[PDB]
Each structure stands twice: as structure tokens, then as C-alpha cells.
Amino acid sequence: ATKLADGKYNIAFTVWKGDKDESSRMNRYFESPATLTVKNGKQYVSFKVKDSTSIKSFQVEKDGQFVETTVLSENKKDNTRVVEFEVADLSKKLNGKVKINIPIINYNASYDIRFVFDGNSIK
Numbered sequence: 001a002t003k004l005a006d007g008k009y010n011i012a013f014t015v016w017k018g019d020k021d022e023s024s025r026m027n028r029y030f031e032s033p034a035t036l037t038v039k040n041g042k043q044y045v046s047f048k049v050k051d052s053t054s055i056k057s058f059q060v061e062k063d064g065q066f067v068e069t070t071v072l073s074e075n076k077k078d079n080t081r082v083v084e085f086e087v088a089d090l091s092k093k094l095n096g097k098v099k100i101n102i103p104i105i106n107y108n109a110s111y112d113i114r115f116v117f118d119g120n121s122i123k
């Protein structure tokens, strides 16, 4: 009654900071709306990642464990990539962590972020 039947959908997301509720800078890197692919009731979120060379790690939590996202495809001419992960409950705010490395300025950082999916946006 409540599930999404198998299919390739769209869903809008916004990225929030790890411990604060504020738009996250990742909103200018992670592109919405994400693609949403359903197979056997396995909900898969996938989207484009720009400036992909500086986002050298991107993980979201899976079953208590922060797990590194699955790159589906890359574009080296763009300096972007396409990543995928599963989200079982899209109501809950998805936890994620990104490591940002910008070698020339010696910027090496690791941040907490969270994804907020808009259910009413599915199509």
C-alpha cells in the first residue's frame, strides 16, 4: 500500500549540515533532483557530483556503518562523476560524510552532512 513499485523516478533533495540545520555548501556540488531507481523494493538514490576531484570521499550511512558511495559513472572532461547509494527510508534524514581535498591551498577536510528528501517530489 505505502511502497514505491519498481521504476525509475525522480526525487528532490536538499543537503543540511551535520549537526546544525542550515543549507550545506554541498548543495552546490550534489545535484538535485536525484534519480531514484526501484528494484525489488530496493530504493536507489543516484546523482551527479561536480568538482569531483576535490570531493575525494563521499559516504552515507548504511546499517549503522558509514559506507562509501558507489560511483556509477565518471566524466573526466567535466570533472564530475555520478554516484549511487540505497535509501530504504526516505523520510529519515540520511547521514553522510564528505572529505574535501584541495592540495594547492593545503585544504584537507572531513565534514558531516545530511540529506533531506522531499517525498512530495517523486514523479
Ligand code: HEM
Pocket: 016, 017, 018, 023, 024, 025, 026, 029, 051, 054, 055, 098, 100, 102, 105, 107, 111, 112
Ligand atoms: C570543493 C571545494 C570545497 C568544498 C566542497 C567545501 C565544502 C565544505 C563543507 C561541506 C563544509 C561544512 C559543511 C557545510 O558548510 O555545509 C565546509 C566548511 C568550511 N569551509 Fe569548505 N569547501 C570547499 C573549499 C573551501 C575553501 C577553498 C575554503 C577556504 C579557502 C573553505 C573554507 C571553509 C571554512 C572556513 C569552513 C568552516 C569550518 C568549520 O567551522 O568547521 N572551504 N566546506
